[PDB]
C-alpha cells in the first residue's frame, strides 16, 4: 500500500498555525523585496536624502518581523517532525516484536536493527528546513503568480526555467532511488556482519580468525563504498545540471531585463526588484530540488521499513479464541501432527502422544529426532500442517496465546539473560509478583543459594547475555523463571515433559516415548521398555 503518515490528524491546529505563519512571512518578504526599487528609482535617482533613512528603518523592521515569524514556524515544524518520527518508530518496533518466529529464524539481526536505525532519515526529511522549503515552494508559486503582472517576458523566461527544473528532476527520478536502495541494502548486510562478528567473538579470538573476518568485512565495506560512489556520481550530475540551468537562466534574465530597459518599456529599478521577486520564485524551487537526495532517501527508507515488517503476517493473526478455558490442566493428545521447518524435510511424521495429566513423561530419541521441535510445537512457536494438537480435549489452536504462553513453562538449552536487575530478570512478564514468590521459586530452583552470595543479592546487574554469571548458573535462573511463571505443562500437580539425552537420569518416570522416524515407535515405563528387545533396549545396552 501507501505509507502516508496519518499521524497529522491530531495535529490539525499546528499545521494551520505553521501555514498561516508561512503565508504572512512570504507576504512580508515580497513586501520587503521592493527596497532596491525604492532605492534606485526614487530615492537616489531623485537625489532626496533624509527619507532614505526612514525607508531603510522601515524595511529593517519588516525583515525583523520576517525573522520573528520564521523563529516560530521552525519550532512548530520541528515539534511535528518529532511527533511523527517517534510514532512511526514505535509502530515498527511493536510490529516487529509481535511478528511470528519463522521471520526471526529466516532473517538476520542486522537487517532488523538496520531497518529500525534507518529512522534518522524520514525525520531528516521532515525537519524544519526540509519541510519549510516545500511550504516556501508553494509560497513561490504564489510569488510567481504575482510576478506575472510585474513584466511579462521575464516571467515567461522564469517559467521556462521551472520547466527545465521539472525535466531535470523527472529524468533523475529513478537513479537516486535505486542508488539509495542499493547503498541501504549493502549497509544492512555490513551491519549484520558486524553484529555477528562482535556478538560471537570467543570463536574468532579462539581460532585465530581475525584476519579472515577482517578481509570479509573489507570486501563488504568496499561494496558499500562502491554503491555510495555511484550515488555520489548521480548526485553530482544532478547538481551540475541544476546549477547550469540556474546560473545561465539568471544571466539570461539580466540580459533580457537590460534589453527591455534600453527599449523603452520597464525600468532599471523594476529589474532590480524583479531579481529579488525572482529569488522568492526560484530559490525555494532550486532549494527543494537540491534537497531531492534527502526526500528520496527518506522515501526509500519508509518503503523498506514498510514493505516487510509492516505488511508481514502477525502472530495473533492465526485463528479465533475461546473463553471457556481458564485452566490448562489436561491430557495432551497429539493426532497425526506433522511439522516441517520451512521446506527442508519433515522433522515429524504422523506422531501420536498420549500424555496423561500430572505425569512425569520423558522423551528420548536420536540426536536429531525432533524433541525440541515437539516442545516448540506445544508452546505455539510454530504450527502443524496436517495434524491437530490438543489439550484437555480441545485443540490449542482455539486458545488465547496469552494463556498458552503463560500456563506452559518451557526451559531450553539456549538460556538467554537480559540486561538488568536479577529480580527484573526473574520477574519477566509478571512484574508485580512479590518478593516471597520469587524467593520460593529460587529456592525450588536451587538458584537461591547462588543469588544470595552475590553483592546486592537480588538487586544486581547482569550485563548482556549472561556474563556476570557462569553458564551453569544461568540454567538455574531459567528454571527459576519458569517456576515463577506458574505453569500447567512444564517442559524441561503439573504435567512435566522432560527432554533428556542421557538414559540414566530419566528411568523412574511414569511413561517414556521414543521417536526415531518422526513418529513414536515405542512407549511405556522403563521396565516394560527394557522388556521389549527394541530400540530403547539397544540404546540402553549401548549406553550402559
For residue 276, the Cα-to-chain-centroid distance in whole angstroms is 44
The item of its own copies, ligand ATP, none sharing an interface with residue 258, based on CB under 5 to 8 Å by kind, is: its own copies
Residue 504 annotated as binding?
Answer: no
User: How far apart are CB 142 and its own copies at their closest, in Å?
Assistant: 21
The item of ligand ATP, its own copies, none sharing an interface with residue 228, based on CB under 5 to 8 Å by kind, is: its own copies
Task: Round to whole Å and give the CA distance between 485 and 402.
Answer: 12
Sole binder of its own copies in the list 25, 35, 172, 274 (CB under 8 A)? 35
Q: What are phi and psi of 284, to 5 degrees?
A: -60, -40
**3-class secondary-structure state, position 390:** strand
Question: Binding segment for ligand ATP among 121-129, 219-227, 364-372, 384-392 (CB under 6 A)?
Answer: 364-372
User: How far apart are CB 477 and ligand ATP at their closest, in Å?
Assistant: 11
Task: Round to whole Å and give the CA distance between 260 and 271.
Answer: 9
Q: What is the footprint of its own copies within residues 389-408 (CB under 8 A)?
A: 402, 405-406
Task: Round to whole Å and give the CA distance between 55 and 38.
Answer: 8
Q: Does 425 bind ligand ATP (CB under 6 A)?
A: no
> Closest CB to ligand ATP belongs to which residue?
472
Q: Whose Cβ is closer to its own copies: residue 93's or residue 537's?
A: 93
Task: Round to whole Å and give the CA distance between 77 and 83.
Answer: 10
Q: What is the size of the binding site for its own copies (CB under 8 A)?
A: 136
Strand bridging mode 390-391 / 495-499: unpaired
Q: Whose Cβ is closer to ligand ATP: residue 367's or residue 527's?
A: 367
Q: Does 468 bind ligand ATP (CB under 6 A)?
A: yes
DSSP single-letter state for residue 227? H
Question: Binding segment for its own copies among 5-13, 81-89, 139-147, 349-357 (CB under 8 A)?
Answer: 81-89
Residue 475 annotated as binding?
Answer: no
Cβ count within 10 A of residue 274: 26
Q: Whose Cβ is closer to its own copies: residue 134's or residue 454's?
A: 454
- Whether 78 contacts 12, CB under 8 Å: no
- Whether 370 contacts 506, CB under 8 Å: no
Q: Say what angle helices 128-149 and 268-290 make with each other, to 10 degrees.
A: 150
Residue 237 annotated as binding?
Answer: no
Cβ count within 10 A of residue 485: 19
Q: Whose Cβ is closer to its own copies: residue 237's or residue 392's?
A: 237
The item of ligand ATP, its own copies, none sharing an interface with residue 70, based on CB under 5 to 8 Å by kind, is: its own copies
Q: Does 369 bind ligand ATP (CB under 6 A)?
A: yes
Question: Binding segment for ligand ATP among 148-156, 306-314, 361-369, 518-526 (CB under 6 A)?
Answer: 361-369
Task: Round to whole Å and give the CA distance between 443 and 426.
Answer: 13
Residue 182 annotated as binding?
Answer: no
- Whether 473 contacts 450, CB under 8 Å: yes
**3-class secondary-structure state, position 489:** strand
Sole binder of its own copies in the list 218, 386, 538, 541 (CB under 8 A)? 218
**3-class secondary-structure state, position 243:** helix
Q: Does 493 bind its own copies (CB under 8 A)?
A: no
Sole binder of its own copies in the list 25, 274, 281, 410 (CB under 8 A)? 410
Q: Does 367 bind ligand ATP (CB under 6 A)?
A: yes
DSSP string, 492-535: ---EEEEE-S-TTTS-S-S-EEEESSSSEEEEE-HHHHHTT-SH
Q: Does 324 bind its own copies (CB under 8 A)?
A: no
Residue 166 annotated as binding?
Answer: no
Task: Round to whole Å and give the CA distance between 499 and 123.
Answer: 50
Residue 130 annotated as binding?
Answer: no
User: How far apart are CB 475 and ligand ATP at their closest, in Å?
Assistant: 8
Q: What is the footprint of its own copies within residues 332-371 (CB under 8 A)?
A: 344-345, 367-368
User: How far apart are CB 167 and its own copies at their closest, in Å?
Assistant: 18
Residue 518 annotated as binding?
Answer: no
- Specify the residue for cell string 536487575: 421
- Specify the residue for cell string 495535529: 11
Q: What is the footprint of its own copies within residues 103-122 (CB under 8 A)?
A: 104-106, 108-109, 112-113, 116-117, 120
User: How far apart are CB 397 and ligand ATP at their closest, in Å?
Assistant: 21
User: How far apart are CB 158 and its own copies at their closest, in Å?
Assistant: 17
Task: Identify which of 136, 147, 408, 185 has the alpha carbon closest to the alpha carbon of residue 286.
Answer: 136
Q: Does 469 bind ligand ATP (CB under 6 A)?
A: yes
Q: Does 173 bind its own copies (CB under 8 A)?
A: no
Q: Does 460 bind ligand ATP (CB under 6 A)?
A: no
Q: What is the footprint of ligand ATP within residues 52-111 (CB under 6 A)?
A: 105
Strand bridging mode 520-524 / 512-515: antiparallel
Q: What is the footprint of ligand ATP within residues 2-61 (CB under 6 A)?
A: none
* Residue 129 CB-density burial (10 A; 0-12 exposed, 13-18 middle, 19+ buried): middle
User: How far apart are CB 414 and ligand ATP at their closest, in Å?
Assistant: 10
Q: Which residues contact 358 (CB under 8 A, 6 or more apart)?
A: 329, 493, 494, 495
Q: Which residues contact 9 (CB under 8 A, 6 or more apart)?
A: none
Q: Does 47 bind its own copies (CB under 8 A)?
A: yes
Sole binder of ligand ATP in the list 171, 248, 467, 532 (CB under 6 A)? 467
Q: Does 464 bind its own copies (CB under 8 A)?
A: yes
Task: Round to whole Å and give the CA distance between 209 and 202.
Answer: 10
Task: Round to whole Å and give the CA distance between 375 and 410.
Answer: 7
**3-class secondary-structure state, position 64:** helix
Q: What is the footprint of its own copies within residues 414-453 (CB under 8 A)?
A: 414, 416-419, 428-431, 450
User: How far apart are CB 44 and its own copies at their closest, in Å?
Assistant: 5
**3-class secondary-structure state, position 323:** coil
Annotated binding residues for ATP, written as ranges, equal: 341, 344, 367-373, 413, 467, 470, 472-473, 501
Annotated binding residues for ADP, written as ranges, equal: 105, 341, 344, 368-373, 413, 467-468, 470
Amino acid at each position: 500500500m501507501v505509507k502516508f503518515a496519518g499521524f497529522l490528524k491530531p495535529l490539525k491546529k499546528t499545521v494551520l498555525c505553521i501555514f498561516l505563519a508561512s503565508l504572512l512571512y512570504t507576504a512580508l518578504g515580497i513586501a520587503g523585496s521592493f527596497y532596491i526599487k525604492f532605492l534606485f528609482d526614487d530615492l537616489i535617482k531623485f537625489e532626496k536624502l533624509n527619507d532614505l533613512h526612514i525607508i531603510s528603518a522601515g524595511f529593517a523592521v519588516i525583515f525583523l518581523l520576517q525573522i520573528f515569524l520564521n523563529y516560530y514556524r521552525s519550532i512548530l515544524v520541528t515539534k511535528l517532525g518529532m511527533s511523527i518520527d517517534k510514532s512511526i518508530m514505535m509502530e515498527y518496533y511493536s510490529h516487529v516484536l509481535k511478528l511470528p518466529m519463522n521471520f526471526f529464524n529466516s532473517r538476520k539481526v542486522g537487517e532488523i536493527i538496520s531497518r529500525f536505525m534507518d529512522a534518522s532519515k524520514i525525520r531528516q526529511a521532515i525537519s524544519g528546513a526540509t519541510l519549510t522549503i516545500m511550504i516556501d515552494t508553494i509560497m513561490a508559486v504564489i510569488g510567481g503568480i504575482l510576478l506575472y503582472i510585474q513584466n511579462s517576458s521575464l516571467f515567461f523566461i522564469s517559467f521556462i526555467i521551472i520547466l527545465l527544473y521539472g525535466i531535470i528532476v523527472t529524468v533523475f527520478n529513478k537513479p537516486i532511488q535505486n542508488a539509495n536502495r542499493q547503498i541501504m541494502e549493502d549497509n544492512a548486510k555490513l551491519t549484520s556482519a558486524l553484529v555477528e562478528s562482535v556478538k560471537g567473538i570467543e570463536t574468532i579470538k579462539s581460532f585465530g580468525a581475525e584476519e579472515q573476518t577482517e578481509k570479509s568485512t573489507r570486501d563488504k565495506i568496499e561494496t558499500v563504498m562502491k554503491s555510495s560512489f555511484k550515488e555520489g556520481m548521480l548526485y553530482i550530475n544532478l547538481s551540475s545540471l541544476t546549477g547550469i540551468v540556474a546560473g545561465l537562466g539568471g544571466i539570461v534574465i539580466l540580459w533580457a531585463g537590460a534589453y527591455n530597459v534600453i527599449k523603452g518599456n520597464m525600468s532599471g529599478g523594476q529589474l532590480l526588484a524583479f531579481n529579488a521577486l525572482l529569488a522568492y520564485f526560484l530559490t525555494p524551487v532550486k532549494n527543494l530540488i537540491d534537497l531531492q537526495p534527502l526526500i528520496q532517501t527518506a522515501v526509500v527508507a519508509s518503503n523498506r521499513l514498510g514493505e516487510i515488517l509492516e505488511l508481514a503476517t502477525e502472530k495473533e493473526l492465526r485463528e479465533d479464541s475461546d473463553d471457556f478455558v481458564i485452566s490448562l490442566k489436561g491430557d495432551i493428545e497429539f493426532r497425526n501432527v506433522d511439522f516441517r521447518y520451512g521446506l527442508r524435510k519433515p522433522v515429524l511424521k504422523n506422531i501420536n502422544l498420549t500424555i496423561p495429566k500430572g505425569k512425569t513423561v520423558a522423551i528420548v530419541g536420536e540426536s536429531g529426532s525432533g524433541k525440541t521441535t515437539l516442545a516448540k510445537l506445544l508452546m505455539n512457536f510454530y504450527s502443524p500442517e496436517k495434524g491437530d494438537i490438543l489439550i484437555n480435549g480441545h485443540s490449542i489452536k482455539n486458545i488465547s496465546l496469552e494463556l498458552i504462553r503463560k500456563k506452559i513453562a518451557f526451559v531450553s538449552q539456549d538460556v538467554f539473560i537480559f540486561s538488568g536487575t536479577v529480580k527484573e530478570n526473574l520477574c519477566l512478564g509478571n512484574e508485580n509478583v512479590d518478593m516471597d514468590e520469587i524467593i520460593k521459586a529460587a529456592k525450588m530452583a536451587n538458584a537461591h543459594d547462588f543469588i544470595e552470595k552475590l553483592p546486592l543479592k537480588y538487586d544486581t546487574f547482569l550485563n548482556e547475555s549472561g556474563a556476570n554469571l557462569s553458564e551453569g548458573q544461568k540454567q538455574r535462573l531459567a528454571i527459576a523463571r519458569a517456576l515463577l511463571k506458574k505453569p500447567d505443562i512444564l517442559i524441561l500437580d503439573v504435567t512435566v515433559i522432560i527432554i533428556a539425552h542421557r538414559l540414566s537420569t530419566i528411568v523412574n518416570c511414569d511413561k517414556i516415548y521414543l521417536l526415531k522416524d518422526g513418529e513414536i515407535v515405542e512407549s511405556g515405563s522403563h521396565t516394560e521398555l527394557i522388556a521389549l528387545k527394541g530400540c530403547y533396549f539397544k540404546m540402553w545396552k549401548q549406553t550402559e
